[PDB]
Amino acid sequence: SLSTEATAKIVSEFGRDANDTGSTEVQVALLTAQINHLQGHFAEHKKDHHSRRGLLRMVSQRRKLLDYLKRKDVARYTQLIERLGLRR
Amino acid sequence: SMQDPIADMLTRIRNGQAANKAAVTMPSSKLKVAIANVLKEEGFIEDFKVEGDTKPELELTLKYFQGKAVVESIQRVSRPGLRIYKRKDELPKVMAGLGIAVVSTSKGVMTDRAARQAGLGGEIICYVA
Amino acid sequence: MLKAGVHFGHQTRYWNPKMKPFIFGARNKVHIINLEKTVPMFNEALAELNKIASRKGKILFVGTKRAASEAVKDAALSCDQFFVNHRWLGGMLTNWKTVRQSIKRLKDLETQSQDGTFDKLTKKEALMRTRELEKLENSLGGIKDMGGLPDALFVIDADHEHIAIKEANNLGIPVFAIVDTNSDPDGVDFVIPGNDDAIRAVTLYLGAVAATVREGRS
RNA sequence: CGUAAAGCGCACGCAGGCGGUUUGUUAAGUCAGAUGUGAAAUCCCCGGGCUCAACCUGGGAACUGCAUCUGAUACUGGCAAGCUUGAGUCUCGUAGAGGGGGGUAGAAUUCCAGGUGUAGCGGUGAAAUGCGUAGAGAUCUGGAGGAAUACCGGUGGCGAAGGCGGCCCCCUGGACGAAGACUGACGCUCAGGUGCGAAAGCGUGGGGAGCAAACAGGAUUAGAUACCCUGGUAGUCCACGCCGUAAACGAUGUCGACUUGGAGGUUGUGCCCUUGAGGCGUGGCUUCCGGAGCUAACGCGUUAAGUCGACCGCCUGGGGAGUA
Ligand SMILES: [Mg+2]
Ligand SMILES: [Mg+2]
Ligand SMILES: [Mg+2]
Ligand SMILES: [Mg+2]
Ligand SMILES: [Mg+2]
Ligand SMILES: [Mg+2]
Ligand SMILES: [Mg+2]
Ligand SMILES: [Mg+2]
Ligand SMILES: [Mg+2]
Ligand SMILES: [Mg+2]
Ligand SMILES: [Mg+2]
Ligand SMILES: [Mg+2]
Ligand SMILES: [Mg+2]
Ligand SMILES: [Mg+2]
Ligand SMILES: [Mg+2]
Ligand SMILES: [Mg+2]
Ligand SMILES: [Mg+2]
Ligand SMILES: [Mg+2]
Ligand SMILES: [Mg+2]
Incomplete structure (x- = not known):
């Protein structure tokens, strides 16, 4: 469900170091990463409603997180949505 | 939820008391204490204690008089x-x-x-x- | 401090939760009571027992089970005390005034066993009325003479004596009982932990009660 | 608001409501005093005047309110910075009919072909319709086709509910456990909103073995538009799209905290000469039973219908009507 390789990658791409796993950005980032991956899973299939529920789950979570950030460090927010490439 | 902690205190007494339970503990707070204080000063609890530091631990001694509880x-x-x-x-x-x-x-x-x-x-x- | 050669504790799962404060057991899937808590309860047991026994002891050694019964028809029976060693005719304390006449029958019969009418009637009626006697005999011995109201009650196994204790609880009769790990306390004013159905814990405390009622004021 | 009226079939989630814990600050809520104002009459209290009273009248009291000023800082709200227990993230693993897609297997039924065999078969309560000398049924052999997956199988397991059982691969959701590390209240609930949502039913193509609404035939019966029998269309199957309801039930909304027990089932994991197929613990989930307590009773009972809090849905006699 995302590669230990790939999840690690992103931790080392958005946090202080690896280990800084729970850093806001890092969550928001490896959620994004899956959410996007998944969009092809549900591109085929589409009738996989059940799995879809986790995906919605994913979005609404990352959304809450994204919100909280903006509330704290509005800087780290903008930087993040630009660099994660969303919020249009 | 944890949203009202004082009712949680009130009830941990209320309950343990009806459970004939000697002591009873709970996460502490400035507020919590100042109350237990009053409870003690007016002789409803036996004696309190806050055995903590980072994760404070308000702890109370219930009394039982005749057979009843005091509360x-x-x-x-x-x-x-x-x-x-x-x-x-x-x-x-x-x-x-x-x-x-x-x-x-x-x-x-x-x-x-x-x-x-x-x-x-x-x-x-x-x-x- | 102990004396109980071997009553240690008794009774396995069936423990009644309220019997926690008098248990420290764990051996082989059965708990041993608090050997050293049974004891300070002979302090108070035989004490307020003998305390009322001098002021005049009228007891009622209530105990049953075809395997311990007759071992109450002794210094328990004999001395300043009365006994019930069979099926406790419910309401015998609570209907004492109904049953009172179940006594008049017993006497008015044995008082006429080797007395009065007897070898007459039929050779039917004979042991075909001592079937009446042998019956009313057990269950309604320790009643016989009552003289001085039942005053405390010594009871063997608290819950197996459901009724008689409850009866007392109702009537203001202080109930001294020994209560296994499984039995329900609090029905007992003077609670005596430890085993209730081994031939010892009985005779021990049993005979040891006889041995303190029996003497208190010379 | 379990069974009397009443928990939306289920889920996510905006507004809103509610929000762990420390310190500082703020002083709106809250609290305090002062001041002004709150018309008179009325009401009430103590009097006074009519022969009493009703009635009239003096004086207080009351007007529980509002507003201004000044103060108080515990609680609530605002601001600031924290904190680690709530909540997330990361690592390894475990169980699973969780979802979606592609393969594939044997047992059977029906059908086609053939061998053998020959007068019945089938069916009911009894029968008859039906089927068989163009040879049925029975029996053996080969083949085609759809549908469902015996045994495992179990108060067994998964899912938010609906619901999900052969085997295999592929994609994928959730849960739990052992450790430790990171985030630092990031949370709970949610009107409106959106998604999902049995079976039936609808739309187009397809598919069709068995079952079977409708319909036909035979029976039963006073009647038989039924129950039984012989047939059998839709439908039941697939793809795409609809519909959005069920006693969608635990007839019990979600979240969190606290409160005696006993016997199982299931599923992780720590420790012990692993030296017993185990032994002692420690989580998740579940079944029966039972204590306080709760309840009209029945019953519920650490998976509460007990003790409490936050939020939401809903009830207010029966019928009329979930109708217009
Ligand atoms: Mg109802
Ligand atoms: Mg607080
Ligand atoms: Mg006025
Ligand atoms: Mg006058
Ligand atoms: Mg504050
Ligand atoms: Mg076949
Ligand atoms: Mg064949
Ligand atoms: Mg998985
Ligand atoms: Mg739908
Ligand atoms: Mg359907
Ligand atoms: Mg169709
Ligand atoms: Mg039919
Ligand atoms: Mg409905
Ligand atoms: Mg059900
Ligand atoms: Mg419900
Ligand atoms: Mg239990
Ligand atoms: Mg029960
Ligand atoms: Mg509750
Ligand atoms: Mg309508």
């Missing part, structure tokens, strides 16, 4: 849904005079008797008897 009834009054604030002439006296009413004021968590003398009022946390 025949412990209800919340104010609460985060609906906050109660009585002036002073309006302060409520429990069981006529017996039993007490824990009230927070511009000068600390006191008893209705005390607050009445003090000449002030405030949020009437709970009732005890």
Whole structure:
């Protein structure tokens, strides 16, 4: 469900170091990463409603997180949505 | 949830008491203590204790008199849904005079008797008897 | 401090939760009571027992089970005390005034066993009325003479004596009982922990009660 | 608001409501005093005047309110910075009919072909319709086709509910456990909103073995538009799209905290000569039973219908009507 390789990658791409796993950005980032991956899973299939529920789950979570950030460090927010490439 | 912790205290007493339980503990708070204080000073709990530091630990000793417990009834009054604030002439006296009413004021968590003398009022946390 | 050669504790799962404060057991899936708590309860047991026994002891050694019964028809029976060693005719304390006549029958019969009418009637009626006697005999011995109201009650196994204790509880009769780990206490004013159905804990405390009622004021 | 009226079939989630814990600050809520104002009459209290009273009248009291000033800082709200227990993130693993897609297997039924065999078969309560000398049924052999997956199998397991059982691969959701590390209240609930949502039913193509609404035939019966029998269309199957309801039930909304026990089932994991197929613990989930307590009773009972809090849905006699 995302590669230990790939999840690690992103931790080392958005946090202080690896280990800084729970850093806001890092969550928001490896959620994004899956959410996007998944969009092809549900591109085929589409009738996989059940799995879809986790995906919605994913979005609404990352959304809450994204919100909280903006509330704290509005800087780290903008930087993040630009660099994660969303919020249009 | 944890949203009202004072009712959680009130109830941990209420419960353990009806469970004939010697002690009873709970996460502490400034607030919590100042109340247990009053409970002790007025002789409803036996004696409290806050065995913590980072993760404080308010702990109380319940008393049992005859066979009963000393706390025949412990209800919340104010609460985060609906906050109660009585002036002073309006302060409520429990069981006529017996039993007490824990009230927070511009000068600390006191008893209705005390607050009445003090000449002030405030949020009437709970009732005890 | 102990004396109980071997009553240690007794009774395995069936423990009644309220019997916690008198248990420290654990051996082989059965708990041993608090050996050293049974004892300070002989302090108070035989004490307020003998305390009322001098002021005049009228006891009622209530105990049953075809395997311990007759071992109550002794210094328990004999001395300043009375006994019930069979099926406790419910309401015998609570209907004492109904049953009172179940006594008049017993006497008015044995008082006429080797007395009065007897070898007459039929050779039917004979042991075909001592079937009446042998019956009313057990269950309604320790009643016989009552003289001085039942005053405390010594009871063997608290819950197996459901009724008689409850009866007392109702009537103001202080109930001294020994209560296994499984039995329900609090029905007992003077609670005596430890085993209740081994031939010892009985005779021990049993005979040891006889041995303190029996003497208290010379 | 379990069974009397009443928990939306289920889920996510905006507004809103509610929000762990420390310190500082703020002083709106809250609290305090002062001051002004709150018309008179009325009401009430103590008097006074009519022969009493009704009535009239003096004076207080009351007008529980509002507003201004000044103060109090515990609680609530605002601001600031924290904190680690709530909540997330990361690592390894475990169980699973969780979802979606592609393969594939044997047992059977029906059908086609053939061998053998020959007068019945089938069916009911009894029968008859039906089927068989163009040879049925029975029996053996080969083949085609759809549908469902015996045994495992179990108060067994998964899912938010609906619901999900052969085997295999592929994609994928959730849960739990052992450790430790990171985030630092990031949370709970949610009107409106959106998604999902049995079976039936509808739209287009397809598919069709068995079952079977409708319909036909035979029976039963006073009647038989039924129950039984012989047939059998839709439908039941697939793809795409609809519909959005069920006693959608635990007839019990979600979240969190606290409160005696006993016997199982299931599923992780720590420790012990692993030296017993185990032994002692420690989580998740579940079944029966039972204590306080709760309840009209029945019953519920650490998976509460007990003790409490936050939020939401809903009830207010029966019928009329979930109708217009
Ligand atoms: Mg109803
Ligand atoms: Mg607080
Ligand atoms: Mg006026
Ligand atoms: Mg006058
Ligand atoms: Mg504050
Ligand atoms: Mg076949
Ligand atoms: Mg064949
Ligand atoms: Mg998985
Ligand atoms: Mg739908
Ligand atoms: Mg359908
Ligand atoms: Mg169709
Ligand atoms: Mg038919
Ligand atoms: Mg409905
Ligand atoms: Mg059900
Ligand atoms: Mg429901
Ligand atoms: Mg249990
Ligand atoms: Mg039960
Ligand atoms: Mg509840
Ligand atoms: Mg309608």
